[PDB]
Amino acid sequence: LDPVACFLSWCRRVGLELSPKVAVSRQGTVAGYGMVARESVQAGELLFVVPRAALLSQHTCSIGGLLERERVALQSQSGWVPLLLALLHELQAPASRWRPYFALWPELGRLEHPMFWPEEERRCLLQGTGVPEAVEKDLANIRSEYQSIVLPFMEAHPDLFSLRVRSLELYHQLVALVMAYSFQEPLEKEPNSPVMVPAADILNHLANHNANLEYSANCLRMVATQPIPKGHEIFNTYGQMANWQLIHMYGFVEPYPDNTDDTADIQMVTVREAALQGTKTEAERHLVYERWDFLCKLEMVGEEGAFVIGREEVLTEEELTTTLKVLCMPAEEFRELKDQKREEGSLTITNIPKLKASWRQLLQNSVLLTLQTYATDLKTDQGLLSNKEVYAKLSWREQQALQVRYGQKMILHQLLELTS
């Protein structure tokens, strides 16, 4: 209302140009602020432009010099500490150049990320989805960074970081904010740090989106990808995001069947386990491990990775195909490979039942094992979803979690049907 007008004046001040066809709004959006079409917009049409000088990053912030100098000491797994420090500084700086931009940020105490749920609820509602494991990894990293890197830096520079921002609670919130708002510019292999992009981060997300961002030398442009009728919300794409990633990083899910990009994971070692099951002799077991190490050699599998299965097609396509091939090939043929190019081809809803029986059997057994990692079967979740009055009675978190589990189990059951 007031903050929106103030933000738009700031836009004018920093050269951020919005098309007259778009409006920043809180009415009729899927969530909080969003952008709507004042007038019908056509595909290819420029929606807005953001000068690179208006981005908020470790480089444009007022302590960019100090941060760059100390880059080595600020390294971490995420690579997000300098941006986080940039944010913590600007937030406590009396004359921050981005104040009107911050004014549109969500209430930091009300973020919906599962990292903010009680651990029991998280573990209970999201078992098997990959979220609980990702979150505990996040919390571990956050913890080490804070005590060994961030807090000491802030304390080494009292003038640049006031007391009110030396807060673990705040640090957690800002990590979540970066996860859900920041943009990472593609390279061209030292990946670009994430940056905050004003205006662009007003747009909500859909798998079926109608806008996307383009990078240029001097600016970022948000452009329409489909026509957008008058009064309709303008949706960016945050990526090809499965529900488990949306809930983890953004604190929301798309209800079924909306998320055409949804996926399920089969752990790579679970396929190995399935292969071992069918073995009888300890000598058969080791040929399996032999096959496995050859696949690790080829960098097609790894002890900690997962194959990724989409609704219509496998995403980790060559990895899975190459694994199935190598695991099911005659012992003889495998000798000639360990001595003397990877496997091509797609794996889709239509292709999979035409694969060799042995590949299908291996895939089938790995899927059964994956489905066993969840607390309940598909039928239970399908029951909660089919009856809308029962669904409506679940808490918000339970609804979100059910959508993650359901999306994943449906994909896995589809694959179960396809592999007979």
Ligand SMILES: C[S@@+](CC[C@H](N)C(=O)[O-])C[C@H]1O[C@@H](n2cnc3c(N)ncnc32)[C@H](O)[C@@H]1O
């Ligand atoms: C880049 S911000 C988008 C602007 C945001 N609506 C706001 O008011 O600040 C990303 C956040 O918006 C929300 N969001 C984006 N798309 C959504 C969707 N399709 N459904 C529900 N929430 C969504 C989530 O809270 C997510 O963390």
